[PDB]
Amino acid sequence: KKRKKKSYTTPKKNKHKRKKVKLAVLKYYKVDENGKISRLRRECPSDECGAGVFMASHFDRHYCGKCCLTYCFN
Amino acid sequence: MLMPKKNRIAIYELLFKEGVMVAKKDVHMPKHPELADKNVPNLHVMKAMQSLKSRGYVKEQFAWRHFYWYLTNEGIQYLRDYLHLPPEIVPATLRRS
Amino acid sequence: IHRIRITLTSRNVKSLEKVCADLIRGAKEKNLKVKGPVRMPTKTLRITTRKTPCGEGSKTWDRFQMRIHKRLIDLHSPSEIVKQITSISIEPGVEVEVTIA
Amino acid sequence: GHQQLYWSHPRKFGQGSRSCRVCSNRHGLIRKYGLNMCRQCFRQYAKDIGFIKLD
Amino acid sequence: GVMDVNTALQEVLKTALIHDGLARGIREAAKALDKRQAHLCVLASNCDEPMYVKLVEALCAEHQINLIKVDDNKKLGEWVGLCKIDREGKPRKVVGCSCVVVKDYGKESQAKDVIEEYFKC
């Protein structure tokens, strides 16, 4: 009988905290400064989601999680 | 723990309409023998019951893998003080005397 | 059909036999012909369990027995007679299953 | 998310699906005839259930 | 003793806080705004940024909601009460929202009526 000896790797880890900005500069912008503004995201034509569902952007496969929709040309 | 507050007010409505109850330890299951079909997830409801009866002011009694509870009038006063619902709404349990 | 069966099941012979005799007497008071009791082989519910809660000592086992006796009696009578003879303040343990078939 | 993990491969011999109905003991279960106890608990209550030492 | 916007606004905010809900985080607030599920929203701007003010005022005009300009939100934050847990605790509030019905669903009040009849005229 001995110990478990979970000691060789990772003696201490620091928590992963997201530097989420309180100001919507990276998230949304108007670039117009007017009452009527344009939106920098593609209109979703799917009717399995809501009418206010806006997707973000990555290098590909805009990862919504709920639907896993990826734009492909068939 | 890891308990929401809408589930908290739902379980407080359940305690107000129920009062005296018997419980069975069931957490990991998706289907309970006698406390399912409440349109609310079972795990959080049972942890809500755990909070109610282990906050440190209402005593418990566990044997034969079951929970029988003696809801003290201190609990009645606590619920009245927090949720501010007058006790003039008598519980429906006082029929068939 | 007027054929009715009564299954009396209990763990002891005394109460079961007394109930069977009383039921047969009540049926026989009426000018009714009734089939004699049939005795099932009394299936035995053996359970063997180690005596010691720990795993120490000589290997000793409790042999627990639960003996279930069951009897069937056949007769021909309408439902009212059966349900009037049933409510006779039966002694505890003699479970009754009355069937029409 | 939750449904992405649960119910992936059926556990058709789940040992943890049973426990002693009196003290919640994992070992020595008595499932015969539906007692579903650790054998110690059964010995504690065997005379009350109806099981008796005759032989 | 007095009747005004703040006196009942503190109570409505505290009731909204107590009955859980509340749009929290950067998401589910703008989404709730753009889905038009609610008919009220209280937003504050005490720092140096006019672009956000202009954007939310344009959105309020789009939703035909008249912006209410209140001074010294610290007055609300100190009159509403911030007892919270134990003897310490002072979490401020900047955003005021109330899902399903604007006043509340637990009580019936004429504060909603006077607010709406002041808004229409």
**CA–CA distances in Å: residue A36 to residues A6, A25, C94:** 59, 18, 86
- For chain D, how many structural domains are there in total? 1
Quote the Cα angle for B44-B46-B49, to 5°: 110
Contact A44, A55 (CB under 8 A): yes
Nearest CA in chain D to B66: D22
**CA–CA distances in Å: residue C34 to residues C83, C96, E98:** 16, 17, 78
Q: Which helix (H) or strand (E) holds E83?
A: none
Is D52 annotated in a binding site? The answer is: no
**Tokens standing for E82?**
């911030």
Chain pair B-E, CB pairs under 8 angstroms? 7
D53/C64 CB distance under 8 A: yes
Collect all residues of chain B within an 8 Å Cβ-Cβ radius of residue E84.
none
3-state helix, strand, coil in chain A (%, to 5): 0, 0, 100
Alpha carbon distance C44, E9 (integer Å): 76
Of the candidates C25, C46, C24, C21, the residue with the CA atom closest to the CA atom of residue C35? C24
Contacts 24+ apart (CB under 8 A), E64-71: E65/E39, E65/E40, E65/E41, E66/E119, E68/E5, E68/E42, E70/E5, E70/E6
How many C-beta neighbours within 10 Å does residue C84 have?
11
Contact E82, E74 (CB under 8 A): no
Identity at E29, one-letter amino acid code = A
Residue C52 Cα, gap to closest chain D Cα (Å): 8
**Which residue range forms the structural domain that includes residue E49?**
5-121
C63/D32 CB distance under 8 A: no
Collect all residues of chain B within an 8 Å Cβ-Cβ radius of residue E21.
6
**CA–CA distances in Å: residue C60 to residues C48, C53, D29, D39, E51:** 10, 11, 18, 13, 86
H helix and E strand count, chain D? 1, 2
How many C-beta neighbours within 10 Å does residue E42 have?
18
Q: 3-state secondary structure string, chain C?
A: CCEEEEEEEECCHHHHHHHHHHHHHHHHHCCCCECCCEECCCCECCEEEECCCCCCCCCCEEEEECECEEEEEEEECCHHHHHHHHCCCCCCCCEEEEEEC
Contact E23, E97 (CB under 8 A): yes
> For the domain B3-97, what is the CATH code?
1.10.10.10
Contact E102, E41 (CB under 8 A): no
Collect all residues of chain D within an 8 Å Cβ-Cβ radius of residue B30.
6
Look-up of token digits 């086992």 = C61
Contacts of D6 (CB under 8 A, 6+ apart): B30
**Tokens standing for B66?**
């079951």
Backbone phi, psi, residue A7, to 5°: -135, -20
Of the candidates A72, A71, A73, A74, the residue with the CA atom closest to the CA atom of residue A42? A71
**CA–CA distances in Å: residue C80 to residues C1, C24, C86:** 15, 16, 10
Q: What is the CATH number of the domain that holds C59?
A: 3.30.70.600
**Tokens standing for E17?**
């806080």
Residue D50 Cα, gap to closest chain B Cα (Å): 18
Alpha carbon distance C7, C71 (integer Å): 5
Of the candidates E6, E2, E23, E1, the residue with the CA atom closest to the CA atom of residue E115? E6
Look-up of token digits 């009955």 = E19
**Tokens standing for A5?**
């000896």
Of the candidates C49, B23, B29, B50, the residue with the CA atom closest to the CA atom of residue D18? B29
- For chain E, how many structural domains are there in total? 1
Is D41 annotated in a binding site? The answer is: yes
Q: What is the CATH number of the domain that holds E28?
A: 3.30.1330.30
Alpha carbon distance C19, A4 (integer Å): 66
Collect all residues of chain D within an 8 Å Cβ-Cβ radius of residue C53.
40
- For chain C, how many structural domains are there in total? 1
Alpha carbon distance D17, D22 (integer Å): 15
**CA–CA distances in Å: residue B57 to residues B45, B49, B72, D34:** 19, 13, 9, 38
CA D35 to chain centre: 7
Can you spell out the DSSP letters for A13-34? ---------SSTTSS---SS-S
C66/D52 CB distance under 8 A: yes
B8/E20 CB distance under 8 A: yes
Is D44 annotated in a binding site? The answer is: no
The verdict on E21 touching B (C-beta cutoff 8 Å) is: yes
Task: Tell me whether residue E105 is exposed, middle or buried, using C-beta atoms within 10 angstroms of its C-beta: 0 to 12, 13 to 18, 19 or more.
Answer: exposed
Alpha carbon distance B8, C61 (integer Å): 51
Alpha carbon distance E64, E57 (integer Å): 10
Could you give the residue ranges of the DSSP H alpha helices within chain E? 5-18, 30-34, 50-62, 73-79, 111-120
The verdict on B10 touching E (C-beta cutoff 8 Å) is: no
Contacts of B78 (CB under 8 A, 6+ apart): B57
Given strand C95-100, what is the order of strands in its sheet?
C38-39, C69-76, C3-10, C95-100
The verdict on E55 touching A (C-beta cutoff 8 Å) is: yes
Q: What is the resolution of this structure in A?
A: 2.9
CA D32 to chain centre: 10
Backbone phi, psi, residue C48, to 5°: -110, 130
Nearest CA in chain E to A36: E58
| Beta strands B67-68 and B22-23, pairing class | antiparallel
In sequence order, what E strands does D1-55 have? Answer: 29-30, 37-38
E42: left (phi over 0), alpha (psi -120 to 50) or beta: beta
Please indicate the experimental technique that yielded this structure: cryo-EM
Contact D25, C53 (CB under 8 A): no
CA E13 to chain centre: 7
Q: Give the three-class secondary structure for B24.
A: coil
Residues 7-36 of B with CB under 8 A from D: 25, 30
Bridge partners of C76, per DSSP, are C3
The verdict on B64 touching D (C-beta cutoff 8 Å) is: yes
Of the candidates E88, E80, E74, E68, the residue with the CA atom closest to the CA atom of residue E7? E80
Residue B41 Cα, gap to closest chain D Cα (Å): 13
Q: Which helix (H) or strand (E) holds B46?
A: helix B42-54
Chain C adjacent subunits, 3+ CB pairs under 8 A: D
The verdict on E54 touching B (C-beta cutoff 8 Å) is: no
The verdict on B84 touching E (C-beta cutoff 8 Å) is: no
Residues 8-67 of A with CB under 8 A from E: 20, 23-24, 27-28, 30, 33-37, 50-52, 54
Contact E43, E95 (CB under 8 A): yes
Contacts of B51 (CB under 8 A, 6+ apart): B1, B3
Q: What is the CATH number of the domain that holds D27?
A: 4.10.830.10
Is D17 annotated in a binding site? The answer is: no
C49/D50 CB distance under 8 A: no
Contact C12, C69 (CB under 8 A): yes
Nearest CA in chain B to D16: B28
| Beta strands C61-64 and C47-50, pairing class | antiparallel
Residues 31-50 of E with CB under 8 A from A: 31, 34-35, 49
Give chain C's end-to-end CA distance (angstroms, integer). 7
Nearest CA in chain E to B82: E18
Bridge partners of A23, per DSSP, are none
**Which residue range forms the structural domain that includes residue C101?**
1-101
Contacts of C92 (CB under 8 A, 6+ apart): C15
What angle do the packed helices B6-18 and B73-83 form, to 10 degrees?
A: 130
Q: Give the three-class secondary structure for B47.
A: helix
Alpha carbon distance C49, D45 (integer Å): 13
Of the candidates A25, A27, A32, the residue with the CA atom closest to the CA atom of residue A54? A27
Alpha carbon distance B88, C2 (integer Å): 60
Bridge partners of C70, per DSSP, are C9
